[PDB]
Amino acid sequence: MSASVTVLWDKEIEGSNEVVKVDEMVASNKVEFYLKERHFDRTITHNITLPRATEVPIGTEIQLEPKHRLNGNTEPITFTYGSLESYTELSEDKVTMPEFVEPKTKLIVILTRNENITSAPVEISVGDIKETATYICQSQSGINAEVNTEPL
Structure with missing residues (x-):
């Protein structure tokens, strides 16, 4: 009813790897800026998939410990x-x-x-x-803010 589990971490495959633009915000001119801070949901999705013809019985528990976690979980x-x-x-x-x-x-x-x-x-x-x-593992990093200045 409960499986022993070992992740072949050294066999890891690197799927997508992207730097994603999340937003841009512009203002022009001292005056005070729109927001002092932005708040963003950050996720990491963990998935297990098995061969279509597996013998693993439905109901089996598979406990593993991922590499990428949030909140210090x-x-x-x-x-x-x-x-x-x-x-x-x-x-x-x-x-x-x-x-x-x-x-x-x-x-x-x-x-x-x-x-x-x-x-x-x-x-x-x-x-x-x-x-x-x-x-x-579908992972997201923390957000980086790049400040760009123009003299207009």
Whole structure:
């Protein structure tokens, strides 16, 4: 009813790897800037997938410990085959804005973050049944603010 689990971390595959533009904000001219801080949802989705013809019985628990986590969570993720095959972590990404737009100056705030997909083999055993599943991590980094100044 409960599997022993080993992630072949050294076999990790690097899927998508992108720096994503999240937003841009512009103002022109001292005057005070629109927001002092922006707040952003940040997620990491963890997935387990099994071969279509697997012998793993429906209901089996697969407990693994991911590499990329949020909020300093350390506890294992518990997937259940055929019920709970995905799990999403949510944290609050707080980003400080520039306070002032300076005189004779147009400022541009560029907000970016990294987003990766990685996958790895998971060796699964329930009793005499062995399987190699695939673990998939959909990750987002913290946001970076680039301040760009023009004399207009």
